[PDB]
Design a protein around this ligand. Structure first.
Ligand SMILES: Cc1ncc(Cn2c(C)c(CCOP(=O)(O)OP(=O)(O)O)sc2=O)c(N)n1
Ligand SMILES: Cc1ncc(Cn2c(C)c(CCOP(=O)(O)OP(=O)(O)O)sc2=O)c(N)n1
Ligand SMILES: [K+]
Ligand SMILES: [K+]
Ligand SMILES: [K+]
Ligand SMILES: [K+]
Ligand SMILES: [Mn+2]
Ligand SMILES: [Mn+2]
Lengths: 332, 371, 371, 332
């Protein structure tokens, strides 16, 4: 491997997603869940038990057609009902790109708020998994970040996944929620059994620090947490570790406040460097924090290739790649 | 004897390919001939006089509006326009068979549904001019109409996207109970899009109360149907998805009404989709054919025709003149409704435009924009 | 009497919806029964003994390979695997009816086409292990095979994408003359994708020499066909696009061969597409059925069966052992072929990895990678 | 309105595209052109005369189905024949996004170079047109910039369009060529009648300057040319004006060389700010040119909204928006 709310239970990240979906269908009689293979529980177990508990009209399989899954979900949402669509791997969200970018994101604007699909959420497994190669590993968030009118949210853990997914489901805008698949059955943590929300468009500073700011999302948050530890032990460097959580609209203020304090920024993500979301954060921080920058903002990202099978260990922006970049930046 | 889950069929011991029947396709249902005469009395819907005069007046008012807005577009007074010529009967006839609250999705040939639903001429005009009265806030190209009150979902330019969406709205209607249909209109060119195959299959497997209404006029822009498909039009595709299907004469308002009435009745009772393909001409016209019917019954004459032609021109010209002299909406409206709530970074862009206009406003056409 | 460009049809004066016939669907063509007996002598292709033994040996060698690689996957020796159980006859039978240079597109159930085309066991293994012998350079998930020599276009994971692509390759073949077909395989689940509607319609309107070969085994992952479609399987969709269509018993290698032979002959002569839907089981098996035929003719017996089972296991195990002990390719190969030529900025990333490994290489599994 | 090679003729930009396509089909017997409505000459006249000259098998209409147009073109290209697809407006390229991103871009890599679709070019009208609103105005290049394995090229004039389109057609990688539609019938210029090439991945410095670098592409190049003039006359500021031309792979070296000289950079594009390609240029220049930067890199872009109908005059990054940003940067 490269990496206050009432009663809780240990849950891994697949279980936390089920818990959020269960809490949703319990409290919102309009809500339905659909997509390929969700009825028997899904290919990553995220919908286990829900059709037996809520009914076949509420948790059901569609034909194998992703542009149809999203257009159908938009249609449900136009009527005001909560529509929770699944796309089986984020790599297969592209057939639905026109329905997401040209239709869902623009629905409310283009109608003058006469119609909307705010009650749509699209959830999909995301990110590398050790051996997924080109079409089981992708992290498409930067493709969606350039589309005003959708929100894109990615959690780092089971507690975070359930509170951010419930926020997506209840938010009155169409949301894509990317579930890091390599964490589905990784370590459990305590997760409240009843519903709770974590705000969208809010980053989280998970460790305070004074020398450098590190920003990541998804599984890569754990990588940068470990880089922080390596930096403290080997270099005596204090790192502020931030999980961005929402890709758009993103929390510009929390990131800029951190960088005004530290004077340094390193952004990391599994997605390719060119056009990746680190470019937006970098260019923005450079505009707002220019006079504070002690060194150039560093992006440690996947290379600009498709995501390889046998070469995955050499492709990912692992802790050594991030640490080496950090070391050079500290020495700039 | 075959035991395959994927299909129910017998064995056959001789190799025989199945040939499409395209020369003798699905026949075209017609109620009145070109002289406005009822062909088969058992099929006459016997609609009452006031309803049939409403069909005729909605079509002709739409036609009057098209003439004026098409000229307005030729002059650059509005930027774009799509007419309804040849499609007045498919739209008024089908709209008349719906309940007022049945939800409509469509594209660029559906303004007659709004006109039957008494959408004000002021609001058609407001959208085309993008003025302060437009509830779409001037954001879309002309003829991208929408009305929440009249259950007509806002038009978008990308073709066929509304097809799977209509199916989702019909699934949600089924769950809500309350006995509503969705109708979804599209042309034969749009039916070539992947989203039509998505909508058609989902409606059947998920058992949705939806009418798919395809208008086939033989052309999509410059493309004749010989380059669009090689089967027997669109109606012949319905049965392959398990969808009950029919083809109708789109120049016959009563054939369209009858097929839509019966499709609505069965879709809502049975929770199954229906496909109607109405054949039309790219422009023996729906208005002329209904006028001949009216005459037969003694329900119209040349004097009434003259007075209505005059009155309709007056009503459209009044709306036209008012629409041209309204201001456009406040430029601040380009930033709202992107999300339900304006994100702070989007508010910052709005503030940036406001500061910009304070300094450079002489260079912007500020004078016909509100506040 | 109707004069509409979009369809050729008569009028009808009574409202009648067209009902799909799904209970009595398109019948299933079969040549030999479950006992391997020829049912209708006029349909027997009378393939010669050496060719029929090749069909049997290709299926069974594929089956032997599946058993071993499926176990390898259960142990984590390879990361992923898809078997061919139930699909050995659809693939070997159809491959046998093609010319060696006809181009094949497919998905995850088509390794039997490669096996009939004498693709070395070493190369199937090399791709699954991503070792130095893999001509795909270890970049894709296991079972994403491809071979330019044997005209078998590299597999990709996204379903149905290969369908419109196969149609473009067939259009280009038509232009090139030289009398080649393209065949395109996909499952019944993949046929629900928008790209299948695209491929099916383009092949008809652009008059392409292509065979669409749909395998229908009643399931796509967990989804039974009752949730996948509501028409009479996939074969019944062909005629709606103007495509000649047939349904065959996928457990009958001779029915598959006959239908593919005749589709190939007519597609290449007529420049028109053919659709074959072969019904199979998600796993009365194609191998058992052909073994019974062989016995009847006196072309096989229990001793030959024993010796071949032994020999095939030996050949697969030899290839397996060699594949596991080969190194993986040089990590530099993750950067080539993204474009034909490596962009300088991509070369910079390659140089960055090389510097990285010089300093931190102890942390990378460098020892089973080439150079 | 907001804005050596042998014999030449005056051509506008639609005519230059026809000329390139004609030269292509004359010299490459494999080449075909297809898409919606191309046979009669196309909705912007770019294919007029070509079917009569080259044959109906070579210039032909497809069904109305963009995912099919691109998949069909990939298939032609797999066989080695030149496939020149048209997408009627760039706004309608999204149905083909999966075929472009998951298939065309990855074709060569994923096969080990056993198969490819290098001989595919997708051409499509692009950019604002005064009244196109949400679906006749889009500039999708940043969505494609995050996809390794495709090239994305945008010309600023008729001379540039013909030489860059011929380069796309002959380049052995799948290329998207975006034709700025508002220039189709704008001013003509002289264009060589016979074929010529302009290199991909090469920016052009069209005016040298010493105080600030301005970078744009498409019609926006003319906007920044006018900003340069305004800056010289009103501020005495010398601007270096650069047309990027190829979005990916982009000419990092020419842009960085300019900024090392000037110490200032302003990037402008019609596409929305967030996730737009100016973020990639900004973040890269900031990494390579950090010590030279006199002021923060400025991005003057469309707002983060869908592209409006009646508000277009207030939405576009016009010369006054660019000039005001430049003025603030010069004064930083
Ligand atoms: C996805 C997409 N592609 C292309 C277009 C361009 N387009 C096209 C190609 C039209 C022809 C539609 O033909 P039809 O048969 O669906 O309808 P009509 O015959 O009534 O025009 S209308 C139009 O705007 C579009 N709007 N959307
Ligand atoms: C675009 C897309 N969506 C979903 C998947 C996931 N998937 C799915 C949903 C499969 C089932 C395919 O069913 P089929 O009927 O086409 O074929 P088989 O029955 O032979 O598996 S195989 C598979 O990888 C995919 N590969 N590509
Ligand atoms: K939502
Ligand atoms: K639409
Ligand atoms: K595929
Ligand atoms: K090319
Ligand atoms: Mn049409
Ligand atoms: Mn299947």
């Amino acid at each position: 491997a490269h990496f206050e709310y009432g009663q809780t239970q240990k849950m891994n990240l697949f279980q936390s997603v089920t818990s959020a979906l269960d809490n949703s269908l319990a409290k919102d009689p309009t809500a339905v869940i659909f997509g390929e293979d969700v009825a028997f529980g899904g290919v990553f177990r995220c919908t286990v038990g829900l059709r037996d508990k809520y009914g076949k009209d509420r948790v059901f399989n569609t034909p194998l057609c992703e542009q149809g899954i999203v257009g159908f979900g938009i249609g449900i949402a136009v009527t005001g009902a909560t529509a929770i669509a699944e796309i089986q791997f984020a790599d297969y969200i592209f057939p639905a790109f026109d329905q997401i970018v040209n239709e869902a994101a623009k629905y409310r604007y283009r109608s003058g708020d006469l119609f909307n699909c705010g009650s749509l959420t699209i959830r999909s497994p995301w990110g590398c998994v050790g051996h997924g190669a080109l079409y089981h590993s992708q992290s498409p968030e930067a493709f969606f970040a350039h589309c005003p009118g959708i929100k894109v949210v990615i959690p780092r853990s089971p507690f975070q996944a359930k509170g951010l997914l419930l926020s997506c489901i209840e938010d009155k805008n169409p949301c894509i929620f990317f579930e890091p698949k390599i964490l589905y059955r990784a370590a459990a943590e305590e997760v409240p059994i009843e519903p709770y929300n974590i705000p969208l468009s809010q980053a989280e500073v998970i460790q305070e620090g004074s020398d450098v700011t590190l920003v990541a999302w998804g599984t890569q948050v754990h990588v940068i947490r470990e880089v922080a530890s390596m930096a403290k032990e080997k270099l005596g460097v204090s790192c502020e570790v931030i999980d961005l959580r929402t890709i758009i609209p993103w929390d510009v203020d929390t990131i800029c406040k951190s960088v005004i304090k530290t004077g340094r920024l390193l952004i990391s993500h599994e997605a390719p460097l060119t056009g990746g979301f680190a470019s937006e954060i970098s260019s923005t921080v450079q505009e707002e924090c220019f006079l504070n920058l002690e060194a150039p903002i560093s992006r440690v990202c996947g290379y600009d290739t498709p995501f390889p099978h046998i070469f995955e260990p050499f492709y990912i922006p692992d802790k050594w790649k991030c640490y080496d970049a950090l070391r050079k930046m500290i020495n700039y | 004897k075959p035991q395959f889950p994927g299909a129910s069929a017998e064995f056959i011991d001789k190799l025989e390919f199945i040939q499409p029947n395209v020369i003798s396709g699905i026949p075209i249902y017609r109620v009145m001939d070109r002289q406005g005469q009822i062909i088969n009395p058992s099929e006459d819907p016997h609609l009452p006089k006031e309803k049939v005069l409403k069909l005729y007046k909605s079509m002709t008012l739409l036609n009057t509006m098209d003439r004026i807005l098409y000229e307005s577009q030729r002059q650059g007074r509005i930027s774009f326009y799509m007419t309804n010529y040849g499609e007045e009967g498919t739209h008024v006839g089908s709209a008349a068979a719906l309940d007022n609250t049945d939800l409509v999705f469509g594209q660029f040939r559906e303004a007659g549904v709004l006109m039957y639903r008494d959408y004000p001429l002021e609001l058609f005009m407001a959208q085309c001019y993008g003025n302060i009265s437009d509830l779409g806030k001037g954001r879309q190209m002309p003829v991208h109409y929408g009305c929440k009150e009249r259950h007509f979902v806002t038009i978008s330019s990308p073709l066929a996207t509304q097809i799977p969406q209509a199916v989702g709205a019909a699934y949600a209607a089924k769950r809500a109970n309350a006995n509503r249909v969705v109708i979804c209109y599209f042309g034969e060119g749009a039916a070539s899009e992947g989203d039509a195959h998505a909508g058609f299959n989902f409606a059947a497997t998920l058992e949705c109360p939806i009418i798919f209404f395809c208008r086939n006029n033989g052309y999509a822009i410059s493309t004749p149907t010989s380059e669009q498909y090689r089967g027997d039009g669109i109606a012949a595709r319905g049965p392959g998805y398990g969808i009950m299907s029919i083809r109708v004469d789109g120049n016959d308002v009563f054939a369209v009404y009858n097929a839509t009435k019966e499709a609505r009745r069965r879709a809502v009772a049975e929770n199954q989709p229906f496909l109607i393909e109405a054949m039309t001409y790219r422009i023996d016209h729906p208005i002329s054919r209904l006028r001949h019917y009216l005459l037969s019954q003694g329900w119209w004459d040349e004097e009434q025709e003259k007075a209505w032609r005059k009155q309709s021109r007056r009503k459209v010209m009044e709306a036209f003149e008012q629409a041209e002299r309204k201001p456009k909406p406040n430029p601040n409206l380009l930033f709202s409704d992107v999300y339900q709530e304006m994100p702070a970074q989007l508010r910052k862009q709005q503030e940036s435009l406001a500061r910009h206009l304070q300094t450079y406003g002489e260079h912007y056409p500020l004078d016909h924009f509100d506040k």
